[PDB]
Design a protein around this ligand. Structure first.
Ligand SMILES: CNC(=O)c1ccc(C)c(Nc2ncnc3c2cnn3-c2ccccc2)c1
Length: 326
């Protein structure tokens, strides 16, 4: 059943993919045209998957996450292959998914309207609800990993991997509700057309957040876990909480209300993804019978810290067991 593979040097690196995929353009990920289906697909060649214990762990995980995620707003695994004829020769991993048109970055890079924002944000939260129900958090949600086609059909890209960029990072990590932070941060940029928090360093970044959220309450200040973090909030002046109505001039009262529940430092009281889907701003789009949860994701492998070869062998095994989706 093994097909013929073919080689090419793209941007200083060799791609050994099957015959089925032609015209590879670097979009490292490639925009390849698929001959069997005749569609445009994205092919990802993994960067030194087994050239460290961490790269290897990262490698297995990503494949485990992909062989699992089946949601219309969560990029799915179409194909997984290796030039490898054997486990002993297994050094390269490739993952195949549908190609998208644009990331939410270039979309605004021209400001977005209300129904446009409602449908982009509804979907972002719809995908999380699934990622979240499989006991997974994205941790690095940003415009560059939310992808859409012409039809505004949205996909959550690069979840559960990664661990200028701080822009969308929840302050308690600078629980699942860390991506809700990123959501509200993305929702703001779509409504205005500006980065809400374009901070230059980890100190600046917090000062901007606090300059809008307000300095934490004496209740929240007692709650905080870091001595250095608490002692840094004290070191800073007392900012009040800014009226979002005055910051987001002209928005749907429910959009501004929505962000109030998205930009809250109390990580225990912040809006969850599922909660946000039921909020008044989404009513036209909201469907409780069409907002699914994920089939339990067995992630016991996470508590295990093996050697390169034990991971590689596991990454090899999962490439074998694959049944492509129809
Ligand atoms: C946890 N691993 C992933 O999420 C993962 C793993 C493997 C692949 C191949 C992908 N897929 C993509 N990676 C990067 N850019 C992508 C896609 C798909 N479309 N676009 C895109 C196309 C045009 C414009 C902007 C973006 C994701």
């Amino acid at each position: 059943e093994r097909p013929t593979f073919y080689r090419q040097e793209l941007n200083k690196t060799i791609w050994e993919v099957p015959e089925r995929y032609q015209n590879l353009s670097p979009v490292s990920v490639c925009a390849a045209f698929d001959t069997k289906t005749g569609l445009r697909v994205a092919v990802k060649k993994l960067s030194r998957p087994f050239q460290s214990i961490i790269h290897a762990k990262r490698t297995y995980r990503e494949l485990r996450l992909l062989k699992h995620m089946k949601h219309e707003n969560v990029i799915g695994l179409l194909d997984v292959f290796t030039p490898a004829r054997s486990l002993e020769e297994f050094n390269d991993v490739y993952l195949v998914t549908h190609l998208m048109g644009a990331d939410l970055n270039n979309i605004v890079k021209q400001k977005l309207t209300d129904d446009h924002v409602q449908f982009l944000i509804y979907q972002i939260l719809r995908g999380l609800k699934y990622i979240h129900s499989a006991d997974i958090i994205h941790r690095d949600l940003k415009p560059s990993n939310l992808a859409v086609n012409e039809d505004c059909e949205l996909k959550i890209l690069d979840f559960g991997l990664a661990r200028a960029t701080r822009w969308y990072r929840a302050p308690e990590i600078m629980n699942q509700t860390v991506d809700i932070w990123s959501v509200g941060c993305i929702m703001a940029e779509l409504l205005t057309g500006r980065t809400l928090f374009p901070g230059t360093d980890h100190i600046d970044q917090l000062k901007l957040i606090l300059r809008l959220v307000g300095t934490p309450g004496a209740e929240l200040l007692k709650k905080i876990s870091s001595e250095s973090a608490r002692n840094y909030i004290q070191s800073l002046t007392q900012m009040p909480k800014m009226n979002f109505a005055n910051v987001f001039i002209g928005a749907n009262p429910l959009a501004v209300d929505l962000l109030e529940k998205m930009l809250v430092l109390d990580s225990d009281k912040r809006i969850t993804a599922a909660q946000a889907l039921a909020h008044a701003y989404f009513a036209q789009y909201h469907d409780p019978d069409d907002e699914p949860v994920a089939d339990p994701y067995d992630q016991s492998f996470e508590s295990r810290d093996l050697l390169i070869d034990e991971w590689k062998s596991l990454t090899y095994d999962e490439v074998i067991s694959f049944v492509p989706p129809p």
